[PDB]
Amino acid sequence: ILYLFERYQPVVKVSNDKGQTWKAVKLFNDRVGYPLSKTVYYQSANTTY
Amino acid sequence: ENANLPATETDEEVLIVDENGSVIVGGCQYDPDESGPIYTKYREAKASTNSTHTPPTSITNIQPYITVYRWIRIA
Amino acid sequence: ENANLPATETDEEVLIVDENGSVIVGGCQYDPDESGPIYTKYREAKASTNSTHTPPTSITNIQPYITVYRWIRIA
Amino acid sequence: ENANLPATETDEEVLIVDENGSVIVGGCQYDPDESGPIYTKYREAKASTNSTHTPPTSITNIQPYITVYRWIRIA
Fold this sequence. Notes:
- It is classed as viral protein.
- This is part of a larger assembly, with 1 copy of chain A and 3 copies of chain B.
- Chain A is mostly beta strands.
- Chain A has a 3-stranded antiparallel β-sheet with strand order 1-2-3, with no helix packed on it.
- Chain B is largely without helices or strands.
- The two termini of chain B are 45 Å apart.
- Classes of the chains: A mainly beta, B little secondary structure.
- Chains in contact: A-B, A-C, A-D, B-C, B-D, C-D.
- Chains B and D meet through strand 1 and strand 2 of B and strand 1 of D.
């Protein structure tokens, strides 16, 4: 629930409280991406990437 | 076997992994570019010596032989 | 004792201090959000191997030995 | 000799270099001035443990034992 991504920095913050409180964490461990619209996470039949 | 070894130090200043550290690997990259060279410093773990040859060589524990066929009379 | 030790080198390639290096440390940065995982490995130093014990396992240098009674002739 | 050795792993963690590695040196430091502390924890290499050791001292084998003259009757 509620993954948020930076444009570059790999640190992402995640909340299971639906925004009531945020917690910062690693696990992107790369430059992530700068797509030209919005969407970053795009997924099908589980297998989110 | 690693029950047999003395204490030792590394032979230089190398960065080990601890939570008082005065050097901070950084949380994450202020890194606006793409290809300016970065590393992957691998996961801090036990630093492995000689795991290629773990069991290896076992030296001979004795002194040169006076050894000759010795027939000890029964009685 | 330390001088009893072969020439040891730990297998997978580990970073150490120098003034010559390729790896930029950074001494200061943005760590603007303290909120990033703050992973600070500690200082450059000497890495202790089996520091727990100087008193290693002591290999028996006894060689296969049948204790045989000796009463020496007084004459 | 450096063949003979248990495998060893340093008594606490430190940073290997693997290309999957978690921690990251960044694509570069952000180094606006010279006053942001430079360093290099330097490029990865072998570990160094006792290069004070060339071939070592060698712990004795033969055990406390009468050193006498075996008298063999020549013929």
